Design a protein around this nucleic acid. Structure first.
Lengths: 52, 111
DNA sequence: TATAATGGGAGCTGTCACGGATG
């Protein structure tokens, strides 16, 4: 995970950090011999796009 | 070499989708589907084999196959994708036959 | 027309001369 921007507020002897984070999470998919991958290596897919 | 199940399914799928693409190309061009299949087959096999086909109304010579390949090349992207699919389908049909040529021997030895 | 099937199988037993191939 990486922090794009950082907003801070001072209150008392503490700082409250509002972080605009950006990160990626994996979800594995199993492919069977009757299935074929219709997507190249490292391509971008949206919601609804077909992968296999 | 013999095919693994995956290679077999992939070749068969490419062949079927290539036939579908030839049908779609006949829909688009208005030409005869057999002429289109023959042109794709000629281009995949090369100029080593170019002969007249009985059912075809036109004598299939390299000049006419070049004319028809140019009529196919002058297509939009979402249309020429069908020509690409057809070419790869014929290329897959070739290897699908060549892979299972052993089965024919194993069957014909008994006749 | 649809389970899967993926490389064969005999062979069976001269005697000489000649011209060409190879080694």
């Amino acid at each position: 995970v990486r922090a794009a921007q950082v907003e801070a507020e001072e209150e008392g002897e503490t700082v409250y950090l509002t972080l605009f984070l950006e990160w990626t999470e994996p979800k594995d998919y199993r492919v069977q011999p009757h299935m074929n991958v219709v997507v190249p290596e490292g391509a971008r897919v949206e919601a609804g796009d077909k992968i296999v | 070499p013999l095919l693994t199940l995956e290679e077999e399914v992939e070749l068969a799928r490419k062949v079927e989708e290539g036939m579908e693409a030839i049908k779609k190309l006949s829909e688009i061009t208005g030409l005869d589907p057999d002429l289109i299949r023959e042109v794709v087959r000629a281009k995949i096999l090369g100029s080593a084999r170019v002969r007249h086909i009985p059912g075809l109304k036109e004598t299939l010579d390299p000049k006419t196959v070049e004319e028809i390949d140019q009529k196919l090349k002058s297509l939009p992207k979402e249309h020429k994708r069908y020509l690409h699919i057809a070419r790869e389908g014929e290329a897959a049909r070739q290897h699908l036959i060549e892979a299972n040529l052993r089965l024919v021997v194993s069957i014909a030895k008994k006749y």
